Every structure is written in structure tokens, then in C-alpha cells.
Amino acid sequence: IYGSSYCRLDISSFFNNISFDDVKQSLSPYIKDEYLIGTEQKLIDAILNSVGYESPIRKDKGMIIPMGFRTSPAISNIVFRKMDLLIQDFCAKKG
Amino acid sequence: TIESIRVKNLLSFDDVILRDFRDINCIIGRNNVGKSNLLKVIRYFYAKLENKKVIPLDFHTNYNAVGEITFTFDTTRIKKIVTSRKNNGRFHKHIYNTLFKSSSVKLNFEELIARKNSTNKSFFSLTLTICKDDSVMWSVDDPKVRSLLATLYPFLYIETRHIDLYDWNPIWKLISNLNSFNFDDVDHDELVNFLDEKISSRKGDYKKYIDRVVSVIDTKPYTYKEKVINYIKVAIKGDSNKFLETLLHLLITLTRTEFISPIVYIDEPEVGLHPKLAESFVSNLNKIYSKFKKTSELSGPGRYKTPYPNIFYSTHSPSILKQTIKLFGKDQQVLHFSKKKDGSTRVNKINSTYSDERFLNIFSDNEARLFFSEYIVFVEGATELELFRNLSLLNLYPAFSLADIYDANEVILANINPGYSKASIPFVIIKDIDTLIDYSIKTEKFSLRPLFEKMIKELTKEFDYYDTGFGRVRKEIDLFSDIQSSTKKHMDSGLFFKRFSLHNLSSRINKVSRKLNRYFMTTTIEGALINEQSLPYFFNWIGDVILTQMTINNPNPDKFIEAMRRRYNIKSQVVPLFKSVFCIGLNHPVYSSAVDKQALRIKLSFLNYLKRKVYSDFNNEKEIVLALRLAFGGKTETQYTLDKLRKDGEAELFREKIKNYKNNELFFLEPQMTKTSGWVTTFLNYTIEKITSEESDDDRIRQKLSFIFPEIISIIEQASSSIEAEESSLTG
Amino acid sequence: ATLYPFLYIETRHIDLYDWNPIWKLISNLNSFNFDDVDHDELVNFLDEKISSRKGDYKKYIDRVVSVIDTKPYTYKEKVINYIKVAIKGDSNKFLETLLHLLITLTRTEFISPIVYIDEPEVGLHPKLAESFVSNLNKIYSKFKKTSELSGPGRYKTPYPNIFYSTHSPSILKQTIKLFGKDQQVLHFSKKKDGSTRVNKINSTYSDERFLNIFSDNEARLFFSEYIVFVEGATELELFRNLSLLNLYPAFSLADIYDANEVILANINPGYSKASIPFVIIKD
Amino acid sequence: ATLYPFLYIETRHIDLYDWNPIWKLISNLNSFNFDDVDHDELVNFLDEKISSRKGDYKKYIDRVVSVIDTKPYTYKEKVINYIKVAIKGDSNKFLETLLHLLITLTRTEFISPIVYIDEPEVGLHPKLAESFVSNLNKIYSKFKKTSELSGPGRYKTPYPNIFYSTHSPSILKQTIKLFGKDQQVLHFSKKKDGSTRVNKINSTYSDERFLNIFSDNEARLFFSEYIVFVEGATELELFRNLSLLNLYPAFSLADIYDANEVILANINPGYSKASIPFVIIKD
DNA sequence: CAAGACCAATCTTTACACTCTGTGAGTATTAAAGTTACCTATAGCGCCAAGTGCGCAAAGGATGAGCTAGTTTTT
């Protein structure tokens, strides 16, 4: 409300373009690095197997976090926190 | 005249907004760090307004990159002054070109006329942004605007804990900036000539002396402020609490003829002061405030309609708050800071305006003390105060001692309105079940009080959509409405209930009304004090009272005891002997061994007689409890007392038996039988001492107290759990 | 006490923002009675000059006074206010101003103050230290009246007593060269059992050449525990050898000076013998 | 920062009671790890030594701690406490002790601090300043290991850098005479338009006679705005006449020195010409 | 091709106008003492008139003597 000029932008395919390795890297610092089951599966992988899905129609992209699941918005915010920080830092200098 | 202050992501603030300022804004709370942070934010903003090099503030979290401070100024009076055709001056035109020029040239010929010239209020918004790299940016890139805003809305800060009485810099700053005189028209030469003429033996001596002095002391020339200060000092005839009073009085007086509205902050106005001194300070401030008020019929010279400046107080004294509430009234507000769950400062408004004149006139220190609390327990009678303020009982529970208990009626509760400051000061209202349901003997039907109807109406919520879990409340409300008749049956001639127990209904209504911060006890305080599990302790207390308080009236105990034993029968005439021998006295003399043995034997015989009569006349052992809790001004089961039963003319035999017991044997207990006598404290202390002697561990004695007294211990435990849940937030 | 005031100045911890000694000196050393100034006349005059409407400044001052009621002004505060309103303005510079004001204002009164100054050269360049004494001497000689030097502005009045506590040879050299017969040097030292002494070191020289060629080496002798007097430069070269003095940590506390018969006569080491021991080595 | 610490010392306003710089310097310069000192073992040792009944000292300590509970000791605080419990005690003396500690506690470590000192001679007798410089030089020379000077207690480690801000010719004379090749003199001055310059003034002399006979007159030339060199006593007598200099208050700011060709070569005034202008007058 | 980002200082500082002495709703609205303020800088060579110039550049003697000019960068 304090501004005189207004601009609007949109992101194309926001949920479909979230890289899975980015999600894994974002969630790694908050999960202990250890083997949950013997010496075959890790705790981080076991937790992350409950949020991804191998889409039959999008087999080219591999497995992605699909829209309609309960945990998708929180993961999206956590992943995009870095980009939000970068954009906010850029916009602060321009006022 | 600031209207809004907003702080985002700085120090201990996430998003804090302060608005609706009054003249006598007062700040209280437990979190002093929040007040210090607010003061630092204001000082930083006003230092950056005047282009001073200061360290930027810190961030609450590092996952952001900006920190914003927003200020809104009400530029309404200045606009009216400048835009008038009567005022033609340099300063007015400069102010218009600086403030109202840019925003007015972008409007058409329709919005300017009849749309912004009738009653509108003009606002000016200034934003300061701090970046991650310690960079400072403004929303308006014009130093002239900032300078004009700083010189039109000055900020003054007063600290009373560390104040030097030998420094009068704030006084001179206020005097120099609140004058309407141009001091540049006073030529130095003519004043020097006048002084020389006034004092001289030979013409020119003073001028030569001044020239010789100046030729040696040649330094930088006087500034304008120094010259005006010197002129004021030569004009006037002379130069902790007194300093603050002088500052406030000067600020009020000098601003009546100027369009500059300062903002003042004062920290700890009552440090090292008598309560009467603080009350007198507030009273004098109010009198000076009311002296210069021109409202309605009050007119004439010396009375103005100029708005008053804004004053903020940081105090920890209930006396100042009480005086401010009583005197100023609608021109003041109370702020409460507190914290959050994760840790962050809040700002809330506490209600301080009352529509009842009696409440304002009867306002005392307890009402002010209610402000400085973290958990308030509201009760109706005076026995609840005697029960909940017992020192021995609170010794074992170091969590209910942090709550304050207050006696409030319906009108007092309405005036206080605890629901407004619900998030800042949690509270619980404890009442009895008689306030909701009334029972009758002649007509076999319950009835609902207007308070119950109001609660049902408040719980009922029309204009709503479906929500899972809300239909149960509607079903409970429907059951409460339909239980209006509730035909039942009373046994023992309208004394007990067939099978109701008043417990399931009480539990259900408590579950329903928990959302409204209410708790309805099944029975009264005396009912909870003496129950079926407390008969041995009550009997032991009565026996101890008989053993201790009863003494021989005659100065010679042996002769009187022998005469009364040889005159009255020891077994059949024991009651007349006890009545005519032992009396209640404050002092307990020590008798001989034989006299002590005889007195002990007589007391044991009296105890045996009373216990045998008690266990013989009554059999079910429940009528004993009923009679005990009814003789001590109480009601049970049917909600009936002595006076109510006598007016209803029911249970003649029970009343006659109680009267016989009172007027025949328990004549000594009668003074400790009226309301507000002091038996509660004595009984509680005796019971706690006995249990402490029997059981050493704290857990064991607490468990035994819970077993003996279920209801009050449950209330204390619930209050303690509520306090522990919110302990982190409401603690500095 | 009121005829012989005592002033003490410490430059080590002097505050430049405090001008109390200056105001005290100006107020005490005055020849005017300020009780005849009155108060109503001055306030009325200022009100007439500064206010367009007749009666604005007076009402403003009355309103201010009515709410700032305090103790009345003393005479000293009143005269200080008058002096401040009559003038156009408010470490080394402070001391120079104090001394100059005292000298200027003592010329028309019989008050004879005595002033003590401690460490006038703290944090001061040697040129500045010399310039301080030079300016003091110039202002001292400006007011002196003697025979031919007669006229207005020249007086026959005793000057106030000034005491210096210095650790720098520059100030001593300047005060010896400039003042001459109007200076003395005091040496404290100590006794064998422990007790402060007071002795006078000769500082007046009849020879004009010696006073003109006075330099830092001559002033260094005043701060010497033991002086060794020699004639030729070969003795200076021999007794100032670093390697030779490295093995004897007791001859390094003595200073060696090249002295002639005329120089020895002018210095006269025998006068201050109990304070500064000396030895004269010849062939 | 931890490899090249910076220590700044002011002497005009210094508190002798506070010993924080000394404790910080000692704690930073050590080669011991105090993490293996068992607290319980030391407490038991003290209890056994100081008590007649076993364990009462431990009871006293835990009773005190249970009531004065606060933040635990940091590493630096406990190191300082351990150092204090092992030593027998806690203006010019403070500075000398700090310099000696700095020089002593750096010969076995690779940490080289940088020291700045402001006004080392404030309120100090000239002999005291000379003794201070001499003591510093002796401390330096004690640990030097060059050529035949070899043995225990002598090291090849570099010495830390020390900067002085002085207004006294005595300290400059002593530091020139003693250190020699291991010292330099900086002159700030100013530019025409207003700016601070930095120049180096020559202070190393190859001639041993000149360095041995170095005195206060030679050191006075370092604080001269303008130097006039002459080759006779008559020129000194003429150019130092008080009456002649009274009428020309522009030549009184120049220092006149009597120098020979060898003295001029040793001084070499041409090296520092933009800082100290000079003129050489001959026949 | 066209584009947000268009320097610092320009002397400083302060301050209501009115008829009414407490109050003001313009279609586009600063100035006036006070105090500084300081300013400043020049070859080829010689000669006589001593810097405002004149002559000559062959001595020398008033127009034969006759003569040259570094690197690099922008460009």
C-alpha cells in the first residue's frame, strides 16, 4: 500500500520443477546422518521415501514431490527459502 | 503527534505495531527487555532523522535480510495553518513546499474540494530500512523532509534513576525551541551602551573593560541558541521529582501558543519517592493539564483549544497507575508487553476506562495491584480469601502463590472486564452451582437463573456454517434448555435427592463453560472444608479447642472444681457443670497436678458424652456432616440454609435438633460459628500440623491433603498447571 | 583570604569544557558595582526592543518564572551573567588565557593573587612550550613602566606570583633567558635520613654572551645527579664511550660537560653544591 | 587476528590498579594446556593439606557454590586463576613490566604482537626516560644470539614491532644511540592543501664518534621547522641575539646549529628536505 | 535499439501572522540577517630605463652569421 508502482510475476510449474536433490540437501542438516535399518538404508532416505513419487507420466524427470500430498507446501517453502532470501537481498538495495 | 509505530525484525520484535496513542500513555509489564528495546528503536529512529552516525540495530533472526521502522505523523493542524489564505510567511510556504506540495499536485479539481477540506485527517509515512550489510535506506530521499519532521515533532527522553540535578540542559532546550521571539534584532552595541550607562563613574569604562576582556578571551562567536539562553537567563530572576515536575509544567505551558507538538518518554518516575509524593506528582500534572482546557462553557483568556503533547510512562508502582486512572480517565491507556511461546515481545492494551463513577471513586491499591499479576482468581465471598491465602497451605504448593485472589461481584466483573486482556493476564472465575440452578420444595421442579440464560445465549452462535465437533455443544445447550422442568424426588422431607448427586450436571457445565474461564464448585467452601473424610480431624480440632481454650473462671481452680463436683453430678449433670465451670479465655493459667488431672478427667467425660450423643442421635453418619456444614452458614443438596428453611417451614425436627445441640452443649463453639469468624484458618493450620507430624515426606502429606480435600486441591492443581503452561511467556 | 587569593592549575587532568577559574578571576577582579543595574529597566528595554506588541517579552518571562521558582541569583552569578551577555564568546590555550587575563586584570587593583601551575608541558611540542613562555614574557613586558617607557596603558603595580612545576628543560631555558632577574630556580632533593630540602640554584648570569648562547645542553645540567666538568672534546669522547660505560652501571648517571674558566665562573657550581655534586677535572 | 595481536597503551590516562593487559598478554603467550588439570584432584589436595578432618573443606566449597551459582569459568579466567595461585604477587613501572613480559614470553613462540605506545614520558624525569630506554635495550641484548654469543637462554626468534609517540628529545637520543641499526624515525608534517604525509628521517650514523658524542642539541634538530647551519661561534652569537630577534618574530622559529663538513655529512639534511627545510651558510 | 542507475556543492541557520493574542481547510506557497571571506598564482638572456620594456639571438659596435631537440599513453 506504500508503493506507487506495482509489478506482478508468476513461476511456471512451481511444484513440478522442484529438484529432489535440492529437497534432500535442504532437509539433511535437520536429520542425523546414520543408518536406520542395518547397513542398507539411511534415516534420511527412509524419511524422504514417504514424500516422493515416481510419476508414470513424467518418467523423464524421475521422481518428484507431487501436488495433492499433505507435506508438499512445507517442503516447497523450505526449498524456496534460499531463493526468497536472495530476491529479498536484491530488492532491498533497490528500495 | 505520532499515530503509528511499526517494527519488523529488529532486536526482540518480529512484527509489532503500536497505535491509538493518548496523552497519558502508560507502559507496564514484566519483560523490561521489551521496553528497553522499544526505547532503543525510537532513539535510533530519531538519531537517523537528524543525520547522526550510530550503530545499526541487530536482527531478531538471520533468515531475513531487512529490518523496517515505520512512523506515521498526523499532519492535520499544520496543513490547516499553512493552507489558510490569512498566513503569508516564509516558514508556512516552505512547509507547504516540503510536506504538502508533492501529494497535492497529483490530484484533480474534484478530490481537492469538498473531499479533503471538510473533516479529513492528513498522514505522513516515513520508513527506515536496515539491510544485511549494515546499510540504511529511507522511503523518502530528501533530507529537508527529515529535518522538517524532526524539528516539528521533537523527542525527549527522561531517565530518573540516574539523573543529575546540576544539569539543566533539557530545560534550556525546551525553552529555546518553544518561543515566538526573534532575538537577532537586539544589537550588541546598544545593549552594551545601556549597561555602561547604568553602571559607570566615568563614561565608557564598562565598554573599555568589555573590550579588554574580549581581546584576551577571543574565541568562537556565540551561536543563536547560546545568545537566546543568555538572554533568558539574564531576564529570569533565578536558576529528582522537582526537576521532572518543572520539565512537565514547562512543556505543558509553553506549547499553548506554538504548533510544535513534542513527544516525551519518562522512565521510572517514582524511583526513591514516597507513595504520597507520586500521588501528588500525578495530581499536580492533572491540575496543570485541566487549567488550560477550553471546552464547552469553560472559556475566557488563558484557556486554549491547542492539542496537548504525548507523554509515555514506564513505571512499576501501582500508586501512579491508580492516580492516572482515577484522574485522567478517558485520556489515558495502559500497555502490557509480556512475551510469546518461542520468545518475542508483544504489545497489548489493558482496559482502564470505566463507566461506573462509584468504581472510579472507590478505586484503591488492590485494583491497581490486579494489573501487576500473571494469574487472577476471582471469588465472591470472604471465606474464599481466608482459604486460598493460608500460609501453611501455600507452603506446600509453590505454584499457586504466584496468583492473586480478588473479591468481585457481577458489576465489579463487568466494570473490570477481564476478557479484554485475556492473552496478557489469564484469569479464572470460581462460582457456586446455586448461581445457575434454583431448587424448590413446594414445587418439584428446577429453575434456571438469568446468568445461565445469558451463558446459553453467548454459547449459542447463529450465523455460522457446519463444523465437526460443534454439534455436541448444541446438544448440551438443548439439554440444558430442556432440563428446565426436570421432575425429581426428595427424601428426608425435602433434604436430600433420590438420585441426582448434582455432580454429573456440574461436571458437564464445567466442561461446557471452560471456554469462558469459569468453574462452578459442586458445594460451597464450608462444604469442601468438612466432608465425610474430614470428620476425625474436625473432631480432633474440637477436642483440642476444648482442652486449650476452656479455663476455670474462678481465680482458685481447686476450690471451685471441688465445690462444683460436690454440687453437680459428674455424669447426669455433666452439662451444667461444664457450662458453669469452664469458660473461653485468651489466657490459659497453669494449675496444680491434681487440678490438672481433675480438669482432664472432666474434659474427657464431656468429650465421651458428646461423641456418644452424636453417634446415638444420628446413625447414617451423613446427617452429622450435613448438620455440621449447615450450622456454619452453609447449604447442602437442596441448596437451603437456616433462614431459607425457616421461611419455607420445612424440616422442623432437624432444625429443632440443631437448635438443641447449639443451645445445650456446643455453647462455647457458637462465637466461632458465624460467617467470617476465623475457624477456617485455625482448622487448616491444625490439620496441616497434624499431617506434617504424622508424615514427613512432602509427597505423602500432599497426597493425604488431596485425599482429605479433593475439590480445593483439584482447583489448586489446575491453576498450577495453567500457570506452568504459561510460565515461560509471563516471566522476564 | 580575600586580599591574597590562591589559584591552583593542574594541566595533567584539566577539563577544557569547564571555565570556572576564568569566571572566578573575571568576577573577583572587577571595579564595578552591579547593584545599580536594576532588573525592571533591563527587562522593559529588552521587551520594547524584541516584541512588536508592547508587553510580550515581559509576560513571557513572568510566565516562565512562575513555574520555575527556585532560589534567587547570588551576586556572583548575576555579575557572571552580565559579563557573559556583554561578551561575544564563551590545554595550552586555556592556561595562556588564564595567565593573560590575570596579568591584564591585576593592573588596576590592589589584589595580588598567587598562582601555582603543575606540568605546563604535558603533551606539548617543544616549540609550543617555548612559545608559551615567550607570549607570557611579551604580555609581562607590555605593561611595564620604567623611566622612558611611560604613557597610557603602562602601570607601576607589582605583578602576581607564579609558581611552576616542570620536568622539561625547554621551559627552564626560556624562563632563564627571557625573564632574567625576575626568576629563580628551586631544587628539592632529600636528606640522608629522609626529609625534603629546599635549595636555590643560581640562574642569573651577568655575562650577556652566556645568556644568548644558552641552549639545551646548559639546561640539562639542572636535572643532573652528578656533573663532571672537562675542557677538551677528547674527554667528552672518552667518558661517553658506550662499551666502556656498559661495564660500569654507576658512571652512566653522571653528565659530562665541556666548561671553560669563564663558563665555570658564570655557572658557579659551588653555590648549589649540596643539591648537585660536581667534580672539575684539569691537567 | 590471533597470530598478529595488536596492543595499544596510553600513559597520559592510565589506571595502575587495572592489570587486564598484563593478564591477557600472559594468557595468550603460553605453551600449556590446562584442560587436563582435574578440579576434584586439586580440591582434594587442598582439603587434605588445609584441614584436620577429612572432607570438610570440600563440604565448605560445595556449600558456597550451591548458593553463589552463576556462569561457569571460561578457559581464560581459569588460566588466569591458575597463574595467580602460583605467583607471589599481583606509570613507568607498569609500562616497563609490560614490555619486559612481552619480550620474555615471545622467544619460544611464533606469535609476534604489534605494540603501540603513546607518550611514554608523560610526567617523567629525563633520567627516568633514559633509564627506561636503557633497560629496554638491555632486555633486548640479553636474548640476542649472534656469532659467538651462543648458549642456553639465547634465541634466534624475531622480536615484535613497537611504535612510540614521543615529544621528548631524551627518548629519541637514547633510542638513536642504543639501538642504532634497529630503529627508524618517522615525521608526519602536512601538505599545502591539507593532508597528512609520512617521511623517514635519517637516524643511522656510520661515524662512531658522532654517535658517542650525541647529545640534546643534536636531538633538538628533529623538532625544528627550519634549520640554519653555521660554521662558527660568532654566527651563533649574532643569530641568537634577543634584541635583534625581538623585531623579527619570524626568524625566532628557526634553530641555528654549528656544524662541520663531517657533521653535515653524518647528519645528511638533504635526505629529509621536504619535512625539515634547511639552509647552509658559508664563506 | 534503448535502458533503471542522472555527482557535490552552490555559505549557515532558523523560523507564525494577525485585527482579533488564541486560532487558522490557497486551484499548487522561503528568505533574511550573520558571518565570513579571502583572495593570489609565472622565463631565454641580457641590458638599463630596473619591470610597464627593448633588442637579439655574430661577435659588436642598433636587420649575414646559422643551426636541433627525449620516451610512453590516450589519439
Swiss-Prot record, chain A:
Mg(2+) binds at D10. Reverse transcriptase (RT) component of antiviral defense system retron Eco8, composed of this RT, the following endonuclease and a non-coding RNA (ncRNA) encoded between them. Expression of retron Eco8 confers protection against bacteriophages T4, T6, T7 and SECphi4, SECphi6 and SECphi18. At multiplicity of infection (MOI) of 0.02 cultures slow growth when infected with SECphi4 but do not collapse, at MOI 2 cultures collapse. Responsible for synthesis of msDNA (a branched molecule with RNA linked by a 2',5'-phosphodiester bond to ssDNA). Belongs to the bacterial reverse transcriptase family. This is Retron Eco8 reverse transcriptase. It comes from Escherichia coli. The chain holds residues 98 to 192 of 374 of the full protein.
Curated annotation (Swiss-Prot), chains C, D:
Residues 94-223 are annotated as: ATPase domain C-terminus. A divalent metal cation 1 binds at E231, D283. A divalent metal cation 2 binds at E235. Residues 24-93 are annotated as: Dimerization domain. Disulfide bonds: none annotated. Homodimer. Belongs to the class 1 OLD nuclease family. Probable nuclease member of antiviral defense system retron Eco8, composed of an reverse transcriptase (RT), this nuclease and a non-coding RNA (ncRNA) encoded between them. Expression of retron Eco8 confers protection against bacteriophages T4, T6, T7 and SECphi4, SECphi6 and SECphi18. At multiplicity of infection (MOI) of 0.02 cultures slow growth when infected with SECphi4 but do not collapse, at MOI 2 cultures collapse. When the retron is cloned in another E.coli strain synthesizes msDNA (a branched RNA linked by a 2',5'-phosphodiester bond to a single-stranded DNA). This is Retron Eco8 OLD nuclease. It comes from Escherichia coli.
